[PDB]
Amino acid sequence: EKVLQSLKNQDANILNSFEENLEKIEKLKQLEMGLLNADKLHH
Amino acid sequence: GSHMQINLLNDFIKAYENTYSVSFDDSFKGRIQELCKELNEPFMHASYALENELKELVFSLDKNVNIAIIGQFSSGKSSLLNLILGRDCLPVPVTFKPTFLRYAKEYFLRVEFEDGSDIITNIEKLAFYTDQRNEVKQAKSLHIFAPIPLL
Amino acid sequence: LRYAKEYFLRVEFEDGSDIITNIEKLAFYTDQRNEVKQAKSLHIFAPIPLLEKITLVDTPGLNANENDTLTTLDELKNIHGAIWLSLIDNAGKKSEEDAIKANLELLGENSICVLNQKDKLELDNVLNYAKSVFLKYFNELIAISCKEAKDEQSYEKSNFQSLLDFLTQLDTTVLKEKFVKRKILNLCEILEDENQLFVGI
Amino acid sequence: MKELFQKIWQNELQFLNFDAKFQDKSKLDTAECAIILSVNKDNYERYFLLKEFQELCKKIDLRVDIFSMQNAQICILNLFKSGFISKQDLLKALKILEKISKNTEIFDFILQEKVQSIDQKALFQNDFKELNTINLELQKLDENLKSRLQKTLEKFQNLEFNIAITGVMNAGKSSLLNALLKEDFLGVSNIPETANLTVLSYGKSEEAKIYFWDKKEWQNILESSHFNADLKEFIDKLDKSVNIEPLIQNIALCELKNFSSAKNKISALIKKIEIKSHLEFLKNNISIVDTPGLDDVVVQREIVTNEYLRESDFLIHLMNASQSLTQKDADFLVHCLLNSRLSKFLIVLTKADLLSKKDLEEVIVYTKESLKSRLVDLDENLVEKIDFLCVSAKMASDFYKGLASKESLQKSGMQEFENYLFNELYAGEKSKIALRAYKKELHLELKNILSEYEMQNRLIKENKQGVSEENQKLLLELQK
Ligand SMILES: Nc1nc2c(ncn2[C@@H]2O[C@H](COP(=O)(O)OP(=O)(O)O)[C@@H](O)[C@H]2O)c(=O)[nH]1
Ligand SMILES: Nc1nc2c(ncn2[C@@H]2O[C@H](COP(=O)(O)OP(=O)(O)O)[C@@H](O)[C@H]2O)c(=O)[nH]1
Name residues 14-73 of chain C within 8 A of B (Cβ).
15-17, 20-22, 37, 45
Distance (Å) from the C-alpha of residue B60 to the closest C-alpha of chain C?
8
Closest-lying ligand to the alpha carbon of D348? Answer: 2
Report the largest interatomic distance among the alpha carbons of chain A, rounded to a whole angstrom.
Answer: 63
Q: Are C20 and B110 in contact (CB < 8 Å)?
A: yes
Report helix, strand or coil for C123.
helix
Contact between chain B and chain A (3 or more Cβ pairs less than 8 Å apart): no
Q: Which CATH class is domain C1-187?
A: alpha beta
Q: Are D429 and B13 in contact (CB < 8 Å)?
A: no
Q: Looking at ligand 2, which residue's alpha carbon is closest to its atom 23? A: D190
Contact between chain D and chain C (3 or more Cβ pairs less than 8 Å apart): no
Burial class (CB in 10 A: 0-12, 13-18, 19+), D297: middle
* Centroid of chain to Cα A3: 28
Classify residue C119 by its DSSP letter: G
Contacts of A34 in chain D (CB under 8 A): 130, 134
* Centroid of chain to Cα D113: 27
- What resolution does the deposited structure have, in angstroms? 3.9
What residues line ligand 1, using a CB cutoff of 6 Å? B 71, 74-79, 91-93
Contacts of C37 in chain B (CB under 8 A): 62
Report helix, strand or coil for C45.
strand
Can you tell me which atom of ligand 1 is nearest the CA of B77? 21
With a CB cutoff of 8 Å and minimum separation 6, the contacts of D237 are D265
Q: Are C143 and C126 in contact (CB under 8 A)?
A: no
Helix axes D66-81, D104-111, angle to 10 degrees: 20
Question: In chain D, whose CA is at the least distance from the CA of B42?
Answer: D46
How many C-beta neighbours within 10 Å does residue C24 have? 9
Query: Cα dist. D168→B127, D193, D395 in Å?
Result: 89, 12, 21
Contact between chain B and chain D (3 or more Cβ pairs less than 8 Å apart): yes
Ligand 2 close to Cβ of residue D300 (< 6 A): no
**Ligand 2 probe mutation, D176, D180, D186, D190, most atoms within 8 A of CB:** D190
Dihedral sign for Cα atoms in the order A20, A26, A29, A31:
negative
C-alpha count within 13 angstroms, C-beta hemisphere, residue B83 = 5
Report helix, strand or coil for D104.
helix
Query: Cα dist. D339→D206, D375, D376 in Å?
Result: 36, 13, 16
Q: How far apart are CA D440 and CA D448, in angstroms?
A: 12
Question: In chain C, whose CA is at the least distance from the CA of B108?
Answer: C20
In DSSP terms, B111 is beta-bridged to B119, B142
Which among D340, D341, D371, D430 is the top mutation candidate for probing chain B, defined by the most B β-carbons within 10 Å of its own β-carbon? Answer: D340
Q: Are C25 and C36 in contact (CB under 8 A)?
A: no
Interface membership of B42 toward D (CB under 8 Å): yes
- Which chains, if any, share at least 3 CB pairs under 8 A with chain D? A, B
Can you tell me which atom of ligand 1 is nearest the CA of B92? 16
Q: How far apart are CA D443 and CA D441, in angstroms?
A: 5
Q: How far apart are CA D174 and CA D291, in angstroms?
A: 9
Instruction: Output phi, psi for D278, to 5 deg.
Output: -115, 100
DSSP sequence for B81-147: HHHHHSS-----------EEEEE-SS-EEEEEETTS-EEEEEGGGHHHHHS--SSS--EEEEEEEE-
Ligand 2 close to Cβ of residue D383 (< 6 A): no
Distance (Å) from the C-alpha of residue B45 to the closest C-alpha of chain C?
24
**Ligand 2 probe mutation, D165, D175, D178, D411, most atoms within 8 A of CB:** D175
Q: Are D439 and A3 in contact (CB < 8 Å)?
A: no
Buried b (16+ CB within 10 A) or exposed e, C136-171: bebbeeebbbbeeeeeeeeeeebbeebbeeeeeebe
Interface membership of B110 toward C (CB under 8 Å): yes
Side chain identity at D99, as an amino acid letter?
K
Q: Are B108 and C20 in contact (CB < 8 Å)?
A: yes
Report helix, strand or coil for D277.
strand
Q: How many residues does chain C have?
A: 201
Structure solved via: X-ray
With a CB cutoff of 8 Å and minimum separation 6, the contacts of D183 are D279, D400
Report helix, strand or coil for D275.
strand
- List chain C domain ranges: 1-187
The alpha carbon of B91 and the centre of ligand 1 are apart by a number of angstroms equal to 7
Q: Are D285 and D238 in contact (CB under 8 A)?
A: no
Task: Pick A38's closest partner by Cβ from D439, D453, D454.
Answer: D439
Q: How many residues does chain B have?
A: 151
The region that residue D286 occupies, defined by phi over 0 for left and psi between -120 and 50 for alpha, beta otherwise, is beta
Q: Are C139 and C166 in contact (CB under 8 A)?
A: no
> Mind spelling out the 3-state secondary structure of D370-402?
HHHHCCCCHHHHHHHHCEEEECCHHHHHHHHHC
- Which chains, if any, share at least 3 CB pairs under 8 A with chain B? C, D
Burial class (CB in 10 A: 0-12, 13-18, 19+), D360: middle
The alpha carbon of D188 and the centre of ligand 2 are apart by a number of angstroms equal to 6
Query: Cα dist. C43→C23, D192, D381 in Å?
Result: 10, 74, 47
Strand order in the sheet with D314-320: D252-253, D208-212, D270-277, D197-202, D286-290, D161-167, D314-320, D346-350, D387-390
Query: Cα dist. D2→B95, B126, D67, D270, D319 in Å?
Result: 71, 73, 14, 66, 45
Q: How many residues does chain D have?
A: 480
Torsion of CA B31, B32, B38, B39, to 10 degrees: 180
The CA-CA-CA angle for residues C34, C37, C39, to 5°, reads 105
The alpha carbon of D193 and the centre of ligand 2 are apart by a number of angstroms equal to 15
Burial class (CB in 10 A: 0-12, 13-18, 19+), C68: middle
The CA-CA-CA angle for residues C185, C189, C195, to 5°, reads 140
Q: How far apart are CA D362 and CA D296, in angstroms?
A: 34
Which among C2, C6, C20, C53 is the top mutation candidate for probing chain B, defined by the most B β-carbons within 10 Å of its own β-carbon? Answer: C20
Closest CA to D406 of D395, D420, D415, D417: D395
Contacts of C16 in chain B (CB under 8 A): 56, 59, 63
